[PDB]
CSV table of C-alpha atoms and ligand atoms in Angstrom, one decimal:
chain,number,residue,atom,x,y,z
A,161,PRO,CA,-38.0,-37.1,37.9
A,162,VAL,CA,-34.6,-36.3,35.5
A,163,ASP,CA,-34.3,-39.7,32.7
A,164,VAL,CA,-32.0,-42.6,33.7
A,165,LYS,CA,-29.6,-44.0,31.7
A,166,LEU,CA,-30.5,-47.6,30.7
A,167,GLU,CA,-28.2,-49.8,28.6
A,168,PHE,CA,-28.3,-54.0,27.6
A,169,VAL,CA,-25.3,-54.9,28.1
A,170,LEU,CA,-23.8,-58.1,25.9
A,171,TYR,CA,-20.6,-58.0,28.0
A,172,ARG,CA,-18.5,-56.2,30.2
A,173,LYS,CA,-15.0,-56.4,31.4
A,174,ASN,CA,-12.0,-54.2,33.1
A,175,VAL,CA,-9.2,-54.0,30.1
A,176,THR,CA,-5.7,-52.3,30.5
A,177,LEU,CA,-5.4,-48.8,28.6
A,178,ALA,CA,-3.0,-50.6,26.2
A,179,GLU,CA,-5.3,-53.6,25.4
A,180,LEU,CA,-8.2,-51.1,24.6
A,181,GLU,CA,-5.8,-49.1,22.3
A,182,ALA,CA,-5.3,-53.0,20.8
A,183,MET,CA,-8.7,-53.2,20.1
A,184,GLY,CA,-8.8,-50.4,17.9
A,185,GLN,CA,-6.6,-52.5,15.0
A,186,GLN,CA,-9.3,-55.3,14.4
A,187,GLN,CA,-12.4,-55.6,12.6
A,188,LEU,CA,-14.2,-58.5,14.2
A,189,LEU,CA,-14.1,-58.8,17.9
A,190,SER,CA,-14.8,-61.8,19.6
A,191,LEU,CA,-17.1,-62.4,22.5
A,192,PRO,CA,-17.0,-64.7,25.1
A,193,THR,CA,-18.8,-68.1,24.8
A,194,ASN,CA,-22.2,-67.8,26.7
A,195,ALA,CA,-22.2,-63.9,26.6
A,196,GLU,CA,-25.7,-63.9,25.2
A,197,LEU,CA,-26.9,-65.9,28.2
A,198,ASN,CA,-25.7,-63.3,30.7
A,199,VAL,CA,-27.4,-60.1,29.1
A,200,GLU,CA,-27.2,-57.1,32.1
A,201,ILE,CA,-29.8,-55.0,32.2
A,202,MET,CA,-28.2,-51.6,33.8
A,203,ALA,CA,-29.8,-48.1,34.5
A,204,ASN,CA,-27.0,-45.3,36.4
A,205,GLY,CA,-24.8,-48.0,36.5
A,206,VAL,CA,-26.9,-50.2,38.8
A,207,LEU,CA,-27.3,-54.0,38.1
A,208,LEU,CA,-31.0,-54.3,37.5
A,209,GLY,CA,-31.1,-58.0,36.5
A,210,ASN,CA,-29.7,-60.3,34.0
A,211,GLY,CA,-31.1,-62.4,30.8
A,212,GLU,CA,-30.7,-64.3,27.3
A,213,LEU,CA,-31.0,-62.8,24.1
A,214,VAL,CA,-33.8,-64.4,21.9
A,215,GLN,CA,-34.6,-64.3,18.3
A,216,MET,CA,-37.9,-63.4,18.2
A,217,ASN,CA,-40.4,-62.8,15.0
A,218,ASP,CA,-39.4,-59.1,14.0
A,219,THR,CA,-36.9,-58.4,16.7
A,220,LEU,CA,-34.1,-59.3,19.3
A,221,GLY,CA,-35.3,-60.1,22.7
A,222,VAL,CA,-34.1,-60.3,25.9
A,223,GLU,CA,-35.6,-63.1,28.3
A,224,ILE,CA,-35.2,-61.7,31.9
A,225,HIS,CA,-34.1,-64.8,34.3
A,226,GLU,CA,-33.3,-62.8,37.0
A,227,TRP,CA,-34.8,-58.9,38.3
A,228,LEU,CA,-32.6,-58.2,41.1
B,101,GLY,CA,-6.6,-46.7,39.0
B,102,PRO,CA,-6.1,-45.2,35.8
B,103,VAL,CA,-4.7,-48.1,33.5
B,104,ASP,CA,-7.8,-49.6,34.4
B,105,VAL,CA,-10.8,-49.3,31.9
B,106,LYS,CA,-14.6,-50.1,32.0
B,107,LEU,CA,-15.3,-52.0,28.9
B,108,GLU,CA,-19.0,-52.6,28.0
B,109,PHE,CA,-20.4,-53.9,24.7
B,110,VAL,CA,-24.2,-51.9,24.7
B,111,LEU,CA,-26.7,-53.8,22.4
B,112,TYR,CA,-28.9,-51.1,23.2
B,113,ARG,CA,-29.2,-47.6,24.9
B,114,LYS,CA,-31.8,-45.1,25.6
B,115,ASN,CA,-32.8,-42.1,28.4
B,116,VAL,CA,-35.7,-43.8,30.0
B,117,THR,CA,-38.1,-42.4,32.5
B,118,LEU,CA,-38.6,-44.3,36.1
B,119,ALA,CA,-42.0,-44.6,35.0
B,120,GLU,CA,-40.9,-46.5,32.1
B,121,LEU,CA,-38.7,-48.4,34.0
B,122,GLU,CA,-41.3,-49.9,36.2
B,123,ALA,CA,-43.2,-51.1,33.2
B,124,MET,CA,-40.3,-53.0,32.0
B,125,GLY,CA,-39.6,-54.5,35.3
B,126,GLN,CA,-43.2,-56.2,35.1
B,127,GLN,CA,-41.9,-58.1,32.2
B,128,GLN,CA,-40.7,-61.3,31.5
B,129,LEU,CA,-39.5,-60.6,27.4
B,130,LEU,CA,-38.5,-57.5,26.6
B,131,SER,CA,-38.5,-56.5,22.8
B,132,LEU,CA,-35.8,-54.8,21.6
B,133,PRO,CA,-36.0,-52.0,18.4
B,134,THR,CA,-35.7,-53.3,15.1
B,135,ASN,CA,-32.1,-53.4,14.3
B,136,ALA,CA,-30.7,-52.4,17.5
B,137,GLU,CA,-28.3,-55.7,16.6
B,138,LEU,CA,-27.1,-53.2,13.9
B,139,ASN,CA,-25.8,-50.3,16.5
B,140,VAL,CA,-23.6,-52.5,19.1
B,141,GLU,CA,-22.5,-49.6,20.7
B,142,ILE,CA,-18.4,-49.8,22.1
B,143,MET,CA,-18.0,-48.0,25.3
B,144,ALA,CA,-14.9,-47.4,27.7
B,145,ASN,CA,-15.5,-45.6,30.6
B,146,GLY,CA,-19.1,-44.8,29.7
B,147,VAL,CA,-17.9,-42.7,26.2
B,148,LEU,CA,-18.5,-44.1,23.1
B,149,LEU,CA,-15.7,-45.7,21.2
B,150,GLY,CA,-16.7,-47.1,18.1
B,151,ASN,CA,-20.0,-49.2,16.7
B,152,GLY,CA,-21.0,-52.6,15.1
B,153,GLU,CA,-23.1,-55.2,14.3
B,154,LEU,CA,-23.9,-58.4,16.5
B,155,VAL,CA,-22.5,-61.3,14.6
B,156,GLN,CA,-23.0,-65.0,14.9
B,157,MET,CA,-19.6,-67.0,14.5
B,158,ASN,CA,-18.8,-70.1,14.7
B,159,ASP,CA,-18.2,-70.3,18.5
B,160,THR,CA,-19.3,-67.6,19.7
B,161,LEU,CA,-21.0,-63.9,18.9
B,162,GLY,CA,-18.7,-61.6,17.5
B,163,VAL,CA,-19.0,-57.9,16.5
B,164,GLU,CA,-18.1,-56.7,13.5
B,165,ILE,CA,-17.0,-52.9,13.6
B,166,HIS,CA,-18.6,-50.3,11.2
B,167,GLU,CA,-16.8,-47.2,12.9
B,168,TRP,CA,-14.1,-46.5,15.2
B,169,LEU,CA,-14.4,-43.1,16.6
C,495,LIG,CA1,-32.3,-70.4,27.4
C,496,LIG,CA1,-30.5,-69.1,24.0
């Protein structure tokens, strides 16, 4: 099979084209509180699961709270 | 509609095989590559707009922009 496009998504939302332009004027973007508690694992547009950011000994990790 | 944009802040993305995805699904704690956090990608309708670095701010996480495309 062909490869699938896997993403670990820290935050997602719908915004308007105007808000998208506004965002580009910023140098530091705040994410909503607890975005780190809802990391979404997605592939080819399908939600696979969600989890939480963890600082491990040498990297960041994602602790899975649910595989769908 | 056309005014609507799907915005994503992506910590890590990769083209993976079905077998690799299967193996991932067996895990409870997934390690990300070293410094994935240095390349948080900002996507709009699946297209890369910019990238930055994950920062712990006072009340939330933030993304420090390093490049807008
Ligand atoms: Ca926790
Ligand atoms: Ca935590």
